[PDB]
């Protein structure tokens, strides 16, 4: 075997008295965050729940079309839209709609829970927000749903500022630089709220 044959993060067999790689096994992943739940298939669809009918076309047209087809926009002369916010009565079926969208879009649904990014361990929280962005790029295209700022009630907490918005705010700034150093994106941000009063002046 030679070193071109290995690709990082493989489980491997090492000898114990000659210490050479006898074989390479299959591959392995790692949870760096204290809760990993990524869904590449959905839990929702169009007919997941009914009565959504007026709304389906409106979200669709906003989110799907630019990601699916960048060329029409480019031709017209408009910039890609960065992130979307949905507000309405608590967790009626709102969340579901996001997950339906990721399926149609044919991307990963990445739910990141905001407060799970901060650690009482030294330095680990600061590293965590930044670290995620780099991962998505390898994963690209992806959906980043900021989880824990409104949910159906599958996952604790509805609302939060200063550490669900604040970590989310950071994302907006990473993206601003990104927008200056590229011109086609494939990273969407999904915010969900009920409240209009959870929104900062910066937001």
């Amino acid at each position: 075997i030679d070193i071109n044959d290995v690709t990082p993060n493989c489980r491997v067999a090492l000898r114990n008295d000659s210490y050479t790689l006898h074989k390479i096994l299959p591959n392995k992943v790692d949870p760096l965050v204290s809760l990993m739940m990524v869904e590449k298939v959905p839990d929702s669809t169009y007919e997941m729940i009914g009565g959504l009918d007026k709304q389906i076309k409106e979200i669709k047209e906003v989110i799907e079309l630019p990601v699916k087809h960048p060329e029409l926009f480019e031709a017209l002369g408009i910039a890609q839209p960065k992130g979307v916010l949905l507000y309405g009565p608590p967790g009626t079926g709102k969340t579901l709609l996001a997950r339906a969208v990721a399926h149609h879009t044919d991307c990963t649904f990445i739910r990141v829970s905001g407060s799970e990014l901060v650690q009482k361990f030294i330095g680990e929280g600061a590293r965590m927000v930044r670290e995620l962005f780099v991962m998505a790029r390898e994963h690209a295209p992806s959906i980043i749903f900021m989880d824990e700022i409104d949910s159906i009630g599958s996952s604790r907490l509805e609302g939060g500022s200063g550490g669900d918005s604040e970590v989310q705010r950071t994302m907006l700034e990473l993206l601003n630089q990104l927008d200056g150093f590229e011109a086609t994106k494939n990273i969407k941000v999904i915010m969900a709220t009920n409240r209009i009063d959870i929104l900062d002046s910066a937001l």
Binding site: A126, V129, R130, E131, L174, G180
Partner: peptide, 16 residues
């Protein structure tokens, strides 16, 4: 390892 410090991107000569 990775610079473990708070959020940073370094960029040489941006487009704009």
């Amino acid at each position: 390892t990775d610079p473990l410090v708070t959020v940073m991107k370094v960029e040489k000569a941006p487009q704009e």
